[PDB]
């Protein structure tokens, strides 16, 4: 049976998902998460769908920016797979961690 | 369809 | 017997009565649905005299 | 419409080299 080589589907999906615009994180799990966090901050705070959608957009933007930075960082170490050290290094150099 | 709804709450419960 | 059940019945919220009926049917169908038969064991004293 | 209409002078153009 035919089978693509490791990384062929990688690039294929890289292209695919870069093209698409649709929001990537599952709506309901995200809503549950934010509701929990808010309940931790203050009990019985109501959230309409627009607020959670906006927050989810912002989260996606922040995450993707971090991923971009880490991707640039990792290849500098001659590697092609990112590792946690790349995450912490990028975050610290961003001045988010410190 | 009313038939089942026409059995009121106490009519379902009875005495 | 549970007073809250009686109050629910009094409410007349058709949904609430439907749910009560569902619970009754569950109880009749097999008790394990409503409450698993508790596995009986001796009372434990915290410390001997 | 068409590229020629996009080129037609009946519009507010911008002059930047990049555009």
């Amino acid at each position: 049976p035919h089978r693509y080589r490791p990384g062929t589907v990688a690039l294929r999906e890289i292209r695919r998902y870069q093209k698409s615009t649709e929001l990537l994180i599952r709506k309901l799990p995200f809503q549950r998460l934010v509701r929990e966090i808010a309940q931790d901050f203050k009990t019985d705070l109501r959230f309409q769908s627009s607020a959670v959608m906006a927050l989810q957009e912002a989260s996606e933007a922040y995450l993707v920016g971090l991923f971009e930075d880490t991707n640039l960082c990792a290849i500098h170490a001659k590697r092609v797979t990112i590792m946690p050290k790349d995450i912490q290094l990028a975050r610290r150099i961003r001045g988010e961690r410190a | 369809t009313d038939y089942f709804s026409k059995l009121s709450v106490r009519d379902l419960l009875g005495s | 017997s549970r007073a809250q059940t009686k109050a629910t019945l009094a409410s007349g919220n058709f949904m609430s009565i439907v749910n009560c009926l569902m619970q009754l049917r569950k109880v009749c169908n097999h008790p394990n649905l409503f409450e698993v038969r508790p596995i009986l064991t001796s009372f434990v004293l915290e410390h001997c005299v | 419409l068409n590229a020629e209409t996009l080129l037609l002078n009946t519009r507010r153009t911008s002059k930047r080299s990049s555009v």
């Binding site: - | - | 596995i39 064991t41 001796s42 434990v44 | -």
Partner: protein, 59 residues
């Protein structure tokens, strides 16, 4: 109440036993008396066991 997945002794020594249930999995540390009960109950890995904490009974 669990099905058994690991059996490790802390070495009459405490035993380490893993358990799973339909909602998830857990690993427990049991006193030597419970270890003796499990040994004398002919429990294997992959057996389902019931532990009442108040009495320390293994079935």
């Amino acid at each position: 109440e669990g099905e058994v997945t690991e059996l490790t002794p802390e070495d009459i020594s405490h035993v380490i036993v893993g358990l799973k249930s339909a909602k998830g999995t857990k690993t427990l540390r049991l006193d030597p008396t419970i270890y003796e009960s499990i040994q004398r109950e002919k429990v294997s890995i992959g057996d389902v066991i019931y532990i009442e904490a108040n009495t320390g009974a293994v079935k």
